[PDB]
Amino acid sequence: SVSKANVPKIDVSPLFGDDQAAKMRVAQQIDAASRDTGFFYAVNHGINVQRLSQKTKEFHMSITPEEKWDLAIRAYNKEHQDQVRAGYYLSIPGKKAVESFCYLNPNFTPDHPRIQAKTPTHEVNVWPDETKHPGFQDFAEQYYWDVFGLSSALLKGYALALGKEENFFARHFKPDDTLASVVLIRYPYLDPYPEAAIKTAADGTKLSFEWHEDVSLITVLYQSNVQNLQVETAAGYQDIEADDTGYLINCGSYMAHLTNNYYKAPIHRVKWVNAERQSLPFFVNLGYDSVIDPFDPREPNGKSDREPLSYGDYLQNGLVSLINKNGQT
Ligand SMILES: CC1([C@@H](NC(=O)[C@H](CS)NC(=O)CCC[C@H](N)C(=O)O)C(=O)O)CC1
Ligand SMILES: [Fe+2]
């Protein structure tokens, strides 16, 4: 058998309030989890995840092949050269099971200065026809802001955990310019399930997505109640239990960089499971020009021998690298 990973449930509700002592006690829990397996479940987060799951299901199960081509990113549709990040990521029956829809900051409108400048990693979202998907765009945009709010609170906890003032990360995480993304991933039930869509780890474990570190500051994830994630620890890969009432939180490699690996970006992978399920990550990305000076909370003077890295450089490079390593999703 595989051992269960220690993934504590942390009540993050104090991070929304003004009880500074209570917030420090939450920060300690975040610190402990970040130094151990690198994962925790945020609970009492205030988001209606059942409704998220329902609205997402309605979308995934009603969108048609025609609509998927019309929304497709450039990896699937050469006509859509501006869609690198935002849009539909098609399945390939017989070969690739997973499919998804990615959207960015709703404030990235045609008149946004970064869109006007054609700055890499900024795109205007694409949406299905309102009549075919009533309420979907409005729901999805509101969800962006709901999970943005949770993420801002979590970033206050991480800042306090690292010995900083609570706005240390959050001051770089702004509605007008965040590069954060939501991905609505559908993992299907298939009978038969094509072997070509199943990868095999060195240890024999059947996978849907190979080992990686996240391209993010932190990742704020909702998934269905079907166990699938594994984290590499000193004791080997361990199973992360599912909890469809909480958000699974972990650091990405930008946090590892900033903290000189005090908070590592945990290596994790997705087991193959033949089950109809959802994986709905929010990747907490900063602004394109955001630079946080790296530091080291294990060193008396706090200094690090790492060089400052702008978030935009980090993100553009990381997303390409992840595609090269683990494939176009
Ligand atoms: C592990 C998990 C998901 N995998 C993923 O989402 C994987 C590894 S974290 N992530 C990516 O491919 C990066 C997608 C970035 C997105 N297009 C953007 O432009 O911002 C899965 O396979 O379920 C939930 C996050
Ligand atoms: Fe990941």
From Swiss-Prot:
Annotated keywords: Antibiotic biosynthesis, Cytoplasm, Iron, Metal-binding, Oxidoreductase, Vitamin C
Effect of residue 229 to T: Abolishes the catalytic activity
Intracellular or extracellular location(s): Cytoplasm, Cytosol
Effect after changing residue 229 to I/V: Strongly reduced the catalytic activity
Broad class of where this protein is predominantly found: cytoplasm
Enzyme nomenclature, EC number: 1.21.3.1
InterPro entries associated with the record: DIOX_N (IPR026992), IPNS-like_FE2OG_OXY (IPR044861), IPNS-like_sf (IPR027443), Isopenicillin-N_synth_CS (IPR002057), Oxoglu/Fe-dep_dioxygenase_dom (IPR005123)
Effect in UniProt of substituting residue 281 to A/I/V: Strongly reduced the catalytic activity
SUPFAM superfamilies the UniProt entry points to: Clavaminate synthase-like
Record's GO cellular component terms: cytosol
Pfam families: 2OG-FeII_Oxy, DIOX_N
Annotated positions binding N-[(5S)-5-amino-5-carboxypentanoyl]-L-cysteinyl-D-valine: 85, 89, 181, 187, 212, 214, 279
Gene3D superfamilies per the UniProt record, alphabetical: B-lactam Antibiotic, Isopenicillin N Synthase, Chain
Residues noted as binding Fe(2+) in the record, renumbered to the chain: 212, 214, 268
The protein's annotated pathway: Antibiotic biosynthesis; penicillin G biosynthesis; penicillin G from L-alpha-aminoadipate and L-cysteine and L-valine: step 2/3
Domain Fe2OG dioxygenase: 174-286
Cofactor remark from the record: Binds 1 Fe(2+) ion per subunit.
Site, as annotated: Transition state stabilizer: 209
Needed cofactors: Fe(2+)
Chain positions recorded as 2-oxoglutarate binding sites: 277
Binding site for isopenicillin N: 85, 89, 181, 187, 279
Record-stated family: Belongs to the iron/ascorbate-dependent oxidoreductase family.
Role noted for this protein: Isopenicillin N synthase; part of the gene cluster that mediates the biosynthesis of penicillin, the world's most important antibiotic. IpnA catalyzes the cyclization of the tripeptide N-[(5S)-5-amino-5-carboxypentanoyl]-L-cysteinyl-D-valine (LLD-ACV or ACV) to form isopenicillin N (IPN) that contains the beta-lactam nucleus. The penicillin biosynthesis occurs via 3 enzymatic steps, the first corresponding to the production of the tripeptide N-[(5S)-5-amino-5-carboxypentanoyl]-L-cysteinyl-D-valine (LLD-ACV or ACV) by the NRPS acvA.
Assembly and interaction partners: Monomer.
Protein name: Isopenicillin N synthase
